[PDB]
Amino acid sequence: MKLAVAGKGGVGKTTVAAGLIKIMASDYDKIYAVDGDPDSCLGQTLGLSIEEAYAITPLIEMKDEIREKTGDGGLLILNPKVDGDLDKYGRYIDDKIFLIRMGEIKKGGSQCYCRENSFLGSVVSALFLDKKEAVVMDMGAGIEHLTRGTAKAVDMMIAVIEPNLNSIKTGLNIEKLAGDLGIKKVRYVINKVRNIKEEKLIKKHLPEDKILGIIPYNELFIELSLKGEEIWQSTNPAFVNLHDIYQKLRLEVG
Amino acid sequence: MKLAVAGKGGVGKTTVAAGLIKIMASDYDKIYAVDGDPDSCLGQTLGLSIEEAYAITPLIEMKDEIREKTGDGGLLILNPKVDGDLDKYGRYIDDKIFLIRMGEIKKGGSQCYCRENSFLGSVVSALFLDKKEAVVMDMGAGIEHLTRGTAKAVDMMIAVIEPNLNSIKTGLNIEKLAGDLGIKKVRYVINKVRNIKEEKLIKKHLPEDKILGIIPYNELFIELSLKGEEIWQSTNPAFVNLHDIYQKLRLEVG
Numbered sequence A, B: 001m002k003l004a005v006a007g008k009g010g011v012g013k014t015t016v017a018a019g020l021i022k023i024m025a026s027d028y029d030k031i032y033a034v035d036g037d038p039d040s041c042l043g044q045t046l047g048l049s050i051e052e053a054y055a056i057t058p059l060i061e062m063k064d065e066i067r068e069k070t071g072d073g074g075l076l077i078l079n080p081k082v083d084g085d086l087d088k089y090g091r092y093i094d095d096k097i098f099l100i101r102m103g104e105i106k107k108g109g110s111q112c113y114c115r116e117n118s119f120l121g122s123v124v125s126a127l128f129l130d131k132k133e134a135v136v137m138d139m140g141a142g143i144e145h146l147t148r149g150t151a152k153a154v155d156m157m158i159a160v161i162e163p164n165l166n167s168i169k170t171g172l173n174i175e176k177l178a179g180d181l182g183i184k185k186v187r188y189v190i191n192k193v194r195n196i197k198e199e200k201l202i203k204k205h206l207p208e209d210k211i212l213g214i215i216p217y218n219e220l221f222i223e224l225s226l227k228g229e230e231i232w233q234s235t236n237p238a239f240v241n242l243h244d245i246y247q248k249l250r251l252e253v254g
C-alpha cells in the first residue's frame, strides 16, 4: 500500500497520517513514514520526542550525500540511483516504522537548488516506484513532492478537510492536482467534525463514494499532544472512526 | 529612454517596437534593440534579412560566454558582471541600432538552466540599470525577462493590444504584471484598428490618459513584410499614427 495524505495546514492531516501508519504497522512487515511537510512534525505526532525527531536529519540537509549522488568533476546527475540507500536516510522509530524527513524545499531566486531538489526527487521515486514496502507520505495541499512518474504508484491520495465551504474547495483542488498528475483514487477524510449539520454539509458537496470517513473533533488531541503521550491509543474515542476509515481504505485498494 | 514593448503573439507588438526604434534612431546617438520574443524576429522587421538576423547569435546560445561568466572550478556566479561586454553580444544593424537577441528561455524538468538564465538576466540588468543608451526591448504578454530590479529603470511599459474584449483583458493583465513588478507607467497602443466602432470600444474600457495612440489595420504591413522592404518607410500611411504615438510617449517620459 502506497499512500499520500494531503491537507491545508491545520486541518490535522499530519495527525491522520500518523494514525494510519500506526494502524498499518501490524498489517505490514515494514512501513516508510514520510514527512513531506516541514510545518508539522510527523515523527513527534508518531510518538517521538523533540530531540529524537530533530536527530533525524532531513533529506534537504544531507549535503555530502547530495553532492555524492548528483556527481562532480563537471558531472550533473539529476536522476541519481538511490533505492539501495534509502535506509541510510532516516531512522527506525521501532521495528516496523522507518521515518524519513523531506525537509524544506527552497526556492529562492538567486541560486541553484537543482541538485538538492533532484536528491529529494530521487528518494520519493525510490520510495514509490522501487520499494516493495508500504509507504505513507504526508504533504501540504500543493502536493508538490509528487510527479506524474511517481503518481503512477500512489494507490490512493487522501485529502483531509474540515466541514466548511472553504476547506471543501481546498479539498477539491487537491483532487484536481492529483488527477492532473494521474492519480486514479482520491478519497476524503473529514476531520474535526463537531455536529451532524456539518456531516450533512459534507454529504451534499461530496459524492458519498469518495468519502473515506469522518473523524470527530475531540479536545483529547490537543491536551494529549501537549505532552509525551501517543494520541492514537485505545483511550481516544475517535480512534474507532480511524479504524473504520482504515478498513474502507483497504477495501478500495484491495 | 528605456522602453519595454509587450503583447500577445500576433498583435503586431514586434512591428510596433521596430517602428519606435526606427524613429528613435535620429533622436539618440545609440539604441539597443532587444528581441525578447523568439516567436518573431525583431531584426528582420527592422530590415535585416533572414541570413543577417540568423548570424546574430542569441544570448541563450553563447555557451562559452555563459560558462566564463558564471564561473567554474566549483564556482557558481549567478550575478556576473557583464556591462562592459554587451557590445560583444550582438551586431550593429547600422551606425545607431545595436541588436541583441535573447533567445529561447528553457524550462524543462530534468535539468539545470540556472547558469543560462543567469546570463540572460545579467545582460537585461546591464541594459536597463548600467547603460546610458536608450533601450527598446520587446517581449510576450508574460514579460518574463523583467524583474523588480530592472523594472526600476523601465521608463514606460507599452502594452500592444487589438480592439476586442479578449485582447483588452490580455492588455490589462500586462498592466497588472508590470505594476506588481513596480513599473510606474503602463500605456496602450491599439493596433490593427479597422473602424470607429472599435475605437469606441477601446475608449470605454481604457482610461484615455493611458492610451498612447491607435494604429490602423493596413494590408501594407503584410504585402510589405513578405519581401525585403522596410514597412516603416514614409510610404506607409499608418506611419503617421506611429509618429503621433512616439511624440505623446516622449511627453510623458520627459
Ligand SMILES: Nc1ncnc2c1ncn2[C@@H]1O[C@H](COP(=O)(O)OP(=O)(O)O)[C@@H](O)[C@H]1O
Binding pocket: A007, A008, A009, A010, A011, A012, A013, A014, A015, A016, A037, A039, A040, A041, A191, A192, A193, A215, A216, A217, A218, A219, A220, A221, A222, A225, A238
Ligand atoms: N480531530 C481532532 N480534534 C481536535 N484536534 C485535532 C484533531 N485532529 C487534529 N487536531 C489538532 O490540530 C492541530 C494540528 O494538527 P496537524 O496534524 O499538525 O495538522 P496539519 O498537519 O494539517 O498542519 C494539532 O493540535 C492536532 O492535535
Ligand SMILES: Nc1ncnc2c1ncn2[C@@H]1O[C@H](COP(=O)(O)OP(=O)(O)O)[C@@H](O)[C@H]1O
Binding pocket: B007, B008, B009, B010, B011, B012, B013, B014, B015, B016, B037, B039, B040, B041, B191, B192, B193, B215, B216, B217, B218, B219, B220, B221, B222, B225, B238
Ligand atoms: N497594423 C497592422 N495592419 C496589418 N498588419 C499588421 C499590422 N501590424 C502588424 N501587422 C502584421 O501582423 C503580423 C504579426 O506581427 P508581429 O509584429 O510579428 O506580431 P507579434 O510580435 O505580436 O507576434 C505580421 O504580418 C505583421 O506585419
Ligand SMILES: [Zn+2]
Binding pocket: A111, A112, A113, A114, A115, B111, B112, B113, B114, B115
Ligand atoms: Zn540549477
